[PDB]
Design an enzyme around this catalytic site. Structure first.
Site, PDB file in Angstrom:
ATOM      1  CG  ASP A   1      -6.961   3.924  -0.256  1.00  0.00           C
ATOM      2  OD1 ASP A   1      -5.740   3.851   0.020  1.00  0.00           O
ATOM      3  OD2 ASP A   1      -7.595   4.999  -0.229  1.00  0.00           O
TER       4      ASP A   1
ATOM      5  CG  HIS B   1      -1.943   1.093   1.203  1.00  0.00           C
ATOM      6  ND1 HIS B   1      -1.702   2.342   1.725  1.00  0.00           N
ATOM      7  CD2 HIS B   1      -3.200   1.125   0.701  1.00  0.00           C
ATOM      8  CE1 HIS B   1      -2.773   3.102   1.548  1.00  0.00           C
ATOM      9  NE2 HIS B   1      -3.693   2.389   0.931  1.00  0.00           N
TER      10      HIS B   1
END
Ligand SMILES: [Ca+2]
Ligand SMILES: [Ca+2]
Ligand SMILES: [Zn+2]
Lengths: 123, 123
Positions: free
Chosen positions: A89, A47
């Site tokens: 996300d 991420h």
């Protein structure tokens, strides 16, 4: 935006991201260094790597669009850059859910800093 | 539940995305011991005391009812035990927001545990 990322974790993983993933391992939390300690920690490393490849908009403050088709999250594609943010996300949220089987806060919550001193893995 | 508590933080503090309360001071996070290091940390101490004074329901996993009439969070439903849980969360969230001017993560984020090894004062 982080607000959406936060809401996506609750929706997809059905858990609190603030009290379960904001100080986990070496990458789940602000910043990151060293090596991911497990599957959940790798989700965060990826991420971080994802946010870092986003050019043309801001992954932290910019807001994107998404809907729910069949209990699943689909990112809006109208604005190209923001869809890239949502994907970062979205993929992380799913990564957390798929790895709940090995989620190990007993070991990695507030994991000692000395354990994350190595040079980070390339993205 | 923790998810609702987090949602209430996002809604009240209007900046729950960058202000975390999962590992702050001696009481903002899992557990708690020693004494509140500042205003925010005292918000978490009172909150922990509020969760400890509840019986009949679980403040961690039980979900309560609440509305957003205007800009405030009104706790409702028809269960005194769950409305108690909601009040513990409602008060703490406002507490966090009214003390944002003092929020000091540079100093209290991941505060060393050895600084909280004093026996806590009564609730
Ligand atoms: Ca990180
Ligand atoms: Ca606590
Ligand atoms: Zn380095």
């Amino acid at each position: 935006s982080l607000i959406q990322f936060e809401t996506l974790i609750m929706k997809v993983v059905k858990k609190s991201g603030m009290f379960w993933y904001s100080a986990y391992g070496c990458y789940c939390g602000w910043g990151g260094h060293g090596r991911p300690q497990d599957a959940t920690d790798r989700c965060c490393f990826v991420h971080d790597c994802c946010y870092g490849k986003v050019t043309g908009c801001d992954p932290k403050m910019d807001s994107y669009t998404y809907s729910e088709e069949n209990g699943d999250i689909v990112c809006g594609g109208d604005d190209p850059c923001k869809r890239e943010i949502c994907e970062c996300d979205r993929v992380a949220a799913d990564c957390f859910r798929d790895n709940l089987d090995t989620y190990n806060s007993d070991t990695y919550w507030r994991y000692p800093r000395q354990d994350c001193e190595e040079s980070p893995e390339p993205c």
